[PDB]
Structure 1
Amino acid sequence: VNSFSGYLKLTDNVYIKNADIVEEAKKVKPTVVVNAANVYLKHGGGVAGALNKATNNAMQVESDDYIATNGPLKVGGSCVLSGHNLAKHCLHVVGPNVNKGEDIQLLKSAYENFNQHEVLLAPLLSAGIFGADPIHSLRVCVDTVRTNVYLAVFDKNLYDKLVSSFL
């Protein structure tokens, strides 16, 4: 039993809700919140910009130190940093950016990072400003993640479409 509430169940291990991930995180304070990061951990907009803003820029300060020490992430890769006031940990995951010509096959590699954590609150990856089709992102998620994932979908119309077309 966990404290996530109001989710539709898609499969044994994937749950979905029309919600702002920032609000879900503040309410639930999960062990892991996933950020839709870029390789530079520059949290400018979308999920990352909103999460960082909710931390009063502490996420960005921590991230800049991470990059100064370690260099950029790989597309498809991840790192575990603090969750600040939103969660115990933040798993920063880089999906491919289709607007940059990055290989959509890397979306599966991105989702594989979720399997290192028993339970996560997450957005769909590579959608939003990253350019990919959220319907495809959901199928990759369901077919790749085996741990328990609670997906927060910001837009109501998209949420309704993802549920209605789910095979």
Structure 2
Amino acid sequence: MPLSNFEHKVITECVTIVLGDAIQVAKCYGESVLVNAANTHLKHGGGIAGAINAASKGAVQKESDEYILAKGPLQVGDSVLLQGHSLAKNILHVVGPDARAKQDVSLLSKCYKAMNAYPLVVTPLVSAGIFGVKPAVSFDYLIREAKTRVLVVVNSQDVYKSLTI
């Protein structure tokens, strides 16, 4: 019943697409890992990264800064599991390829594979906004790689229906 107050559709045995705010979906599941669509330096912009940071009152950005000081920047396709900040059990910061920077879009395979370590994942379509990848392409990589329970959350009905037609 958590998904009763969201428009949703089962796509595969692993993957369900959901209309809404990924942050609000993750909050319905205590055991969820929320995916952040990040960049290599975890400097969070106006996309879901900014929404996540704002919800955490800046704690996520500060935590990110400390991680990057200690370990250096992530490579495209990499991820790091950090604190949930009461948004989820944990937040998995994933670095999708940036198509505007002519990066290799197939690195989305590595992004989504990283999610399989967790029993329940709530994720946006990585790279499908500021990083300029078509939502259908990001979606196709997700369903190729998914081997755990994934709620893929899109905040646009246009996007939702384009992927459920």
Which bracket does the TM-score occupy, shorter chain normalised?
Answer: over 0.9
Structure 2 runs not aligned, ≥5 long: none
Quote the residue 2:156 is aligned against: 155
Work out whether residues 30 and 121 of structure 1, in 8 Å CA contact, stay in contact via their aligned partners in 2.
Answer: no
1:103 aligns with 2:98: no
After TM superposition, list the pairs within 5 Å mapping 1:12-91 onto structure 2: 12-91=13-92
Structure 1 runs not aligned, ≥5 long: none
Q: CA deviation at 1:30?
A: 4.1
Quote the residue 1:126 is aligned against: 127
Identical pairs, percent = 42
Amino acid at match of 2:52: L
Amino acid at match of 1:51: I
TM-score (norm 2): 0.93
TM-score (norm 1): 0.92
Work out whether residues 122 and 152 of structure 1, in 8 Å CA contact, stay in contact via their aligned partners in 2.
Answer: yes
Aligned residues: 163
Amino acid at match of 1:125: V
Q: CA deviation at 1:8?
A: 1.1
SS, match of residue 80 in structure 2: strand
Quote the residue 1:10 is aligned against: 11
Q: CA deviation at 1:21?
A: 1.0
Work out whether residues 20 and 154 of structure 2, in 8 Å CA contact, stay in contact via their aligned partners in 1.
Answer: yes
SS, match of residue 128 in structure 1: coil
Q: CA deviation at 1:44?
A: 1.4
Work out whether residues 26 and 32 of structure 2, in 8 Å CA contact, stay in contact via their aligned partners in 1.
Answer: no
RMSD, aligned α-carbons: 1.4
